[PDB]
């Protein structure tokens, strides 16, 4: 997906009293047209097993 997306995701996750590091934010938000990066996902397993 486009880096912009990654930012919106990670940044909205930031828990109370925190923000996504700047440099990371900027590199992510500065990405231009045609650039892509892997979608961030929350990995949860089936503990019960």
């Amino acid at each position: 997906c486009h880096p912009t997306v990654v930012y919106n995701y990670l940044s909205s996750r930031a828990p109370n009293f925190l923000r996504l590091d700047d440099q990371v934010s900027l590199k992510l938000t500065s990405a231009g047209i045609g650039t892509l990066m892997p979608r961030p996902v929350v990995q949860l397993l089936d503990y019960d097993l």
Binding site: P3, V6, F17, L18, V24, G34, L36, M37, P38, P40
Partner: protein, 48 residues
């Protein structure tokens, strides 16, 4: 010949300039905001 061509006819769409792909990013979070003094809600505790 026409039919032989029309059989071997199929289109594909490709992007002129390849996508620029990146690696993941370490989602580092840092503190923000200022904290004030919050006093205990119950007040002095009973003795002993």
């Amino acid at each position: 010949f026409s039919e032989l061509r029309n059989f071997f006819t199929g289109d594909v769409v490709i992007r002129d300039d390849p996508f620029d792909v990146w690696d993941g990013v370490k989602a580092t979070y840092i503190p923000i905001g200022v904290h004030g003094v919050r006093l205990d809600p119950n007040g002095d505790q009973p003795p002993l």
